[PDB]
A paper describes a structure:
The first class, which accounts for 47% particles, is a PCNA-FEN1 complex with a short DNA in the central channel of PCNA. In these structures, FEN1 binds to one monomer of the PCNA ring, and the other two PIP box accommodation sites are vacant. One strand of the DNA, which is the template strand, is continuous, and the daughter strand is disconnected at the catalytic center of FEN1, resulting in a ~90° bending of the bound DNA. The high-resolution density maps show that the phosphodiester bond of the 3′-end of the 5′-flap DNA in the catalytic center of FEN1 is broken, indicating that the DNA substrate is in the post-catalytic state. Interestingly, the DNA substrate in our structures is different from all previous ones: The cleaved 5′-flap remains stably bound in the enzymatic center, with the +1 nucleotide of the 5′-flap still basepairing with the template strand. During the 3D classification, the PCNA-FEN1 particles were grouped in eight classes for structural refinement. Two major differences on the bound DNA in these states are their orientations relative to the PCNA ring and the bending angles between the upstream and downstream dsDNA segments. The DNA was seen to have a rotation around the channel axis of PCNA. These states are named state A to state H based on the clockwise position of the downstream DNA in the side view. The angle between the upstream and downstream DNA in state A is 107°, and it increases to 129° in state H. By aligning PCNA in different states, the changes in DNA angles can be observed more intuitively. In conclusion, these analyses show that FEN1 is dynamic on the PCNA ring, which could undergo continuous conformational change to accommodate the DNA length variation between PCNA and the catalytic center of FEN1.
Among them, PCNA (Proliferating Cell Nuclear Antigen) binds to the polymerases and acts as a sliding clamp to tether them on DNA, enhancing their processivity. Eukaryotic PCNA is a homotrimer, forming a ring encircling double-stranded DNA. One example of the PCNA-coordinated process is the lagging strand maturation, which involves at least four PCNA-interacting enzymes, Pol δ, RNaseH2 (Ribonuclease H2), FEN1 (Flap endonuclease 1), and LIG1 (DNA ligase 1). Two structurally resolved classes (PCNA-FEN1 and PCNA-FEN1-RNaseH2 complexes) have captured a series of 3D snapshots for the primer-removal steps of Okazaki fragment maturation.
Author numbering:
A (entry chain C), C (entry chain B): 1 to 255
B (entry chain D): 2 to 352
D (entry chain A): 1 to 254
Write the structure that this text describes.
DNA sequence: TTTTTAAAAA
DNA sequence: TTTTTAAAAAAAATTTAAATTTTTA
DNA sequence: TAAAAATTTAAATTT
């Protein structure tokens, strides 16, 4: 018996557009204290850690810690059935085979019920410990889309260098030799253009690019990407959703 | 091969079939049923009836097929090993004789297709006249030897050695079209190796661990289940098919409860129906020890592979040159580590 | 000599873009007091009934009841060679096999002369009259295009329930149960937004979705859709063009 | 040590997006007073003549008359990484065959260095200027892209007639028979949208249209086309880049 | 080696 | 009526050249 | 609001 009503509806559309092309079999860990999606790629390369808390939902009411598992292509089509201003009311029953989505119109002429059926689905949960990351950089998200897309044009691997002066995204391949230095802002105090390069140690890690393109498909969710990593841990591509939580992405480095 | 196993798994367990992408893995070492690929590029690759021949009057279609498939799957990051068929056992020779009589019937109807002048019947009846030979085995082994991509000669059929390769953990998957590796004990089985088009036949995995978890059965229970489905060693019970076998294994144990429960008038047991070593070679096959041999994805030899693949087999230089430069591009090192090495699994969720 | 100077040439551009993917060979039954088309080119009943009256054109001069066969995707390409603010002139000499299309740009710079090579083809129309449409809904074309475009993602069957409170575009299939309901809004001062329903008895008719998607791809002709249907009479998808006529589509229900 | 500080890097981006599909391998004849490119196409029926002079770059430096073989699809996919307002600074080495391109932002936050793998290919000059061009048509490039895109739907061969009152584009085929008489509009006080023409002899000649569609992809470079043609002499499709140089396009008529 | 599927069959 | 057996249907892959969606403003 | 641009499909060849 689960019912979550959102006073802005485009954020779940952005979450499903972020989570369509990456993973398809995801199980929604819905508790009384929030909505969680701890899920992982089918080839065990990338992890998705969505957290939507109770403070941003207009009417959040879930009694038991019920877990549902949808097809995220199907739920992405259902979230493509809603417009950008539709009031989205989630709706479910106890052990229900169907997930009901009520896309209420903001001007109240289109109340579109959507009974999307579930499936029997299990996803293993990998517990991320709370750890201090060395290269914690907070940097603009459309800029990250530009970096990931324009280096996925070049090759298949990005060798990120973190230092005191700035972060350095370097990609190599047969096409050429990309090397993008992204320095620290010293003049702009706006949060949507600030590129903070605060360190604990300099690191040098090599990640993939199709998975980083799938990661940076979460561009309209947030302006800032708290890109947190260290020398051995997979990086945290965190998109701070406005007063609901964070869509955290995890990708293991190549060795 | 098992008749209707994949339809039974798609009816029962949708959580064990994972339709993934071709490019999704990028470093998951798989094991190829090689002779299945030889036949899959011998029937399918033709000039509308004319197989890809040479100047010496010997075929080359399976070599170009494995070339194009292996470059298209290493370009997506998959590192294969091609486990070849060896000696089929004496218990398999009944269905081998049935395939030989099917080939004899197809060669009989090929003469009527030639005399009738039908241009499409002759193509469909030279489809069934295929033969993996020792010449074909040595030719495919020589092509994969000049690939730098390893091949493992099995002492039995290749499905059991692929299952032993996955069970030892030397590879991570058994990329094999038929479902014999699920009853030979491989936890991972991906099918439909079509790296060209994603929408045509996507890569579907077959988690045997998920099959043995949602059914609750163990390994030998799944072996006896595949026996009552019917395989290429032992015939099935007359009147018992896919829907009866899940009921006859799932609340049950083995062969002995069937032969002390099922009366021999409604569902009669076949005469000379051997299961005593059919179960035994399915659990314990004559395979290679995978800790002995080492998988070596070495650098390819260039110029003699170009001259053997082109001047002896009537091929353009630029296609084979593009294939070997794509292999040298695809083999740069930089092994992609998985997330299970870094984050520990703290359980799962139900639905 | 048939003559039709149309100053709002985007109307004919949108008519040909609507009928490009639906009808391939259509007869242009040109009358002395209007331009008519009645054709179908589908295995399902996909009758397209177009009216282009002579009152809304800038200059009409036809002295014969000629009807020419047109490979309609070629005329759709030639009408796609026109502009959105372009004056479109139609000429047809009696002894010629050409439908002469002349485009006059409004800055009087680009003057075109396209000749559409006609061919001889005869099809038999069926002639659906206005046979007492019990349930008619007037509603925005963007709303109907949105509803059909996202209900085609679920399945193929749309059932259309209607009452006094609103129209219900329920659809179910392989993915879920999508139930888009609407509300009659007579209080909206915007007349193109104001959903008005005239209903005699409630109706519930199963319809196809690819043919109805081809029907609702006639969107930017008119802001409103005069969608009308009866209990067993086929559906009418009407685009009342502004003082030009109507583009009526006919969809047989799936019993 | 070649170095070319270019402020408006969208000019070079629109050059390489105008030459990616027509040209697959090209040579950049870098002189000390500009850069040239006189390469052939893949089917060897057209010729692309490109010139960016050194008076449009911010700073420019050369030491030799170095020519480098550049895969233009590769440099087009590298020039897609720059923004529409990002500056572009080319860099070349004597010992190493790399074309380094750094893409600084208008602010000082993002520097995008981008090297290249240069091919090795022969150089030759087939310009042949002063061909006694009979008529010019100075029409807008969006209008010419509209002409090529609309006439491409009918057939693959176009004939172009020139007269004193305007220029006539017309083709034929099974799909129809089009004829666009683009008129004299020099009366417009905007010279940039005006069509100006001069005439010495009436011409009518059959050009190709697929390679004309390949030519007209330089419509974001300049918003005028200085097309000049003759009886048997191949035409130009000249794209006069603003205070930087010019890009021509030759096609021998069929 | 695979899937359908339309007749039969308990 | 679900099902089991039976007699059929079949086993790719690359470039090349339209077609159908997504984004850009 | 449209067209580049990424994407998908079908056809002849891959010998």
């Amino acid at each position: 018996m689960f019912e979550a009503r959102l006073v802005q509806g485009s954020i779940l559309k952005k979450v499903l557009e972020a989570l369509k092309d990456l993973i398809n079999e995801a199980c929604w860990d819905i508790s009384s204290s929030g909505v969680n999606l701890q899920s992982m790629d089918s080839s065990h390369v990338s992890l998705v850690q969505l957290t939507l808390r109770s403070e941003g939902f207009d009417t959040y009411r879930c009694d038991r810690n019920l877990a549902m598992g949808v097809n995220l292509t199907s739920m992405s089509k259902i979230l493509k059935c809603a417009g950008n201003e539709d009031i989205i009311t989630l709706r479910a029953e106890d052990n229900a085979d169907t997930l009901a989505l009520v896309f209420e119109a903001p001007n109240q002429e289109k109340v579109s019920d959507y009974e999307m059926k579930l499936m029997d689905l299990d996803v293993e949960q990998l517990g991320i410990p709370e750890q201090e990351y060395s290269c914690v950089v907070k940097m603009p998200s459309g800029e990250f889309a530009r970096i990931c897309r324009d280096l996925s044009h070049i090759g298949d691997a990005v060798v990120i260098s973190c230092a005191k002066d700035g972060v350095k995204f370097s990609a190599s391949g047969e096409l050429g030799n990309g090397n993008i230095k992204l320095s620290q802002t010293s003049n702009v105090d706006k949060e949507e253009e600030a590129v903070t390069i605060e360190m604990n140690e300099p690191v040098q890690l090599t990640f993939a690019l199709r998975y980083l393109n799938f990661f940076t498909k979460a561009t309209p969710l947030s302006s800032t990407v708290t890109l947190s990593m260290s020398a051995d841990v997979p990086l945290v591509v965190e998109y701070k959703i406005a007063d609901m939580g964070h869509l955290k992405y995890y990708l293991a480095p190549k060795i | 091969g098992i008749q209707g196993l994949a339809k039974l798994i798609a009816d029962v367990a949708p959580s064990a079939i994972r339709e993934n992408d071709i490019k999704s893995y990028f470093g998951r070492k798989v094991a190829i049923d090689a002779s299945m690929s030889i036949y899959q590029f011998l029937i399918a690759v033709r000039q509308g009836g004319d197989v890809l021949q040479n100047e010496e009057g010997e075929t080359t279609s399976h070599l170009m097929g494995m070339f194009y498939r292996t470059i298209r799957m290493m370009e997506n990051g998959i590192k294969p090993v091609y486990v070849f068929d060896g000696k089929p056992p004496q218990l398999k020779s009944g269905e081998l004789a049935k395939r030989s009589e099917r080939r004899a019937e197809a060669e009989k109807q090929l003469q009527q297709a030639q005399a009738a002048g039908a241009e499409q019947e002759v193509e469909k009846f030279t489809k069934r006249l295929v033969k993996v030979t020792k010449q074909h085995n040595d030719e495919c082994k020589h092509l994969l030897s000049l690939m730098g991509i390893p091949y493992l000669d099995a002492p039995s059929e290749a499905e059991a050695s692929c299952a032993a390769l996955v069970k030892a953990g030397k590879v991570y998957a058994a990329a094999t079209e038929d479902m014999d590796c699920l009853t030979f004990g491989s936890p991972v089985l991906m099918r439909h190796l079509t790296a060209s088009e994603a929408k045509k036949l996507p890569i579907q995995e077959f988690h045997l661990s998920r099959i043995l978890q949602e059914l609750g059965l163990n390994q030998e229970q799944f072996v006896d289940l595949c026996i009552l489905l019917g395989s290429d060693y032992c015939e099935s019970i007359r009147g018992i098919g896919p829907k009866r076998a899940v009921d006859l294994i799932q609340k049950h144990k083995s062969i002995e409860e069937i032969v002390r429960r099922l009366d021999p008038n409604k569902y009669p047991v076949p005469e000379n129906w051997l299961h005593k070593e059919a179960h035994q070679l399915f659990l314990e096959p004559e395979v290679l020890d995978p800790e002995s041999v080492e998988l070596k994805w070495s650098e390819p030899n260039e110029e003699e592979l170009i001259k053997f693949m082109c001047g002896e087999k009537q091929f353009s230089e630029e296609r084979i040159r593009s294939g070997v430069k794509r292999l040298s591009k695809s083999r740069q090192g930089s092994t992609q580590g998985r997330l299970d090495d870094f984050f520990k699994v703290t359980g799962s969720l139900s639905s």
